[PDB]
Amino acid sequence: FMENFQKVEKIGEGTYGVVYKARNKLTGEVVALKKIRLPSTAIREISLLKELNHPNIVKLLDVIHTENKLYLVFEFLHQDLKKFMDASALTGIPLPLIKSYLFQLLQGLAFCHSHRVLHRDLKPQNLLINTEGAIKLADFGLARAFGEVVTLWYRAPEILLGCKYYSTAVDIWSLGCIFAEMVTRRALFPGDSEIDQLFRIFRTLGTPDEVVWPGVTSMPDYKPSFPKWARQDFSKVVPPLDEDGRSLLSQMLHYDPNKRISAKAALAHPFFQDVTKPVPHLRL
Template sequence: MEQYEKVEKIGEGTYGVVYKGKHRHTNETIALKKIRLEQEDEGVPSTAIREISLLKEMQHRNIVRLQDVVHKEKCIYLVFEYLDLDLKKHMDSSPDFKNHRIVKSFLYQILRGIAYCHSHRVLHRDLKPQNLLIDRRTNSLKLADFGLARAFGIPVRTFTHEVVTLWYRAPEILLGARHYSTPVDMWSVGCIFAEMVNQKPLFPGDSEIDELFKIFSIMGTPNEETWPGVASLPDYISTFPKWPSVDLATVVPTLDSSGLDLLSKMLRLDPSKRINARAALEHEYFKDLEVA
């Protein structure tokens, strides 16, 4: 850690404290994430070190760059490029989102980052507005924390005992699926898309069952016909209330028809029917976007 200096604490992430820091030799501002590990006594698992080392290879303009990994006895510091604004803070403070061009540009950049990660077989699993970072000077957006869930797991609570949000979690995960893949991230993107347009979360559940019911009451309760295999997922219960699906145009009323079409393809309950990131980038919703 000698080459890095902590400047100030800037937040508490899922895994540990986040500091603003600087590189002693170059003076470059960086973000330092201290990863606290569950088994404090055992040190850092080698699997986690391997996973994280692979992430240094990931280089894309829509991904927050992992510059370095510093291994101390009981913890790991991850050194990232520094961005001071996230999408949640930006949505809370900026009138920009009345402008659908900004929403479209941000959504496109999210998808571009995800398509890159998925093409490298890396999932995020915990996408939310708080880990989408924005560079105010250029209005460019970058995904943070990609690949960390696989290295460290997703805790139920953060190390400060805050509950990790369920609002963006895919239904297959909520239903206890052990094997899931890239569609879980596309579900999260759909939730974030709707939230950018509506300026409020789409499925703000406060427990796993409440989250499922919020999803089903809009998307319809799934069954073997609409989602083959759903009944054999560990946490599926045949006595779930049977909600019909609601027209998404009533849920996201200011979104145009091509936007609604794309959103509905991201929010398919059956993950095998969900659109993938590459196909989403080609969707007609983006045809009038000037791509930078």
């Protein structure tokens, strides 16, 4: 039971608490209702995100603070990208659709980053799709406002090396990992711990050094004793992605966050010359 919603049903466990599909009692509308598992600072800052509207961002409809509980109300979409890539594993997602989704996601990130809002925890479970061929990012801005098993697979290397500063580049990294996973039908870096995560990145991209990443050796959790692995070609990592897609991915996965392509620059990349917006085959 809820005093403002009916037919409340559990969708999943999210980063912050249970996620429900719910019907607004007044309007009849179906929404995603997120219970935040337990602060005044967070309420004003998340409430600012109610203004932050774009076709490729999941709309934060409301912030409800009642009975000393906090709920976030979002626009409901029928599938996430995790489920869609599982459902598409035999065939793969068609390349035009991968390109459409990556393009759209970059437009959402470019919008949020232009408004000084980061995600910091992008993952297939917070990328949501609809029947019309759109993809939208959920939960932008929540990590900065708020502070089972956490997925590390999309975490940028500076975060894993204990940098307590964030930048836009953390989201480009995450999205490049997602881009690779859509193409290969395998997670790029499926670490089960922070050091396994780090070392999976190093064994693909090479152990970073002061040449490719000035400042890295002074990172808080950098250890001079890290093994020194050589870097692999993207040609072996993401076949059969073409030269253009491999060049763009390379730029999204630079070690130094400052060298990583911006979302705005990535939209101009030659990979998107032939972008279209296809219809997905969604089984709901």
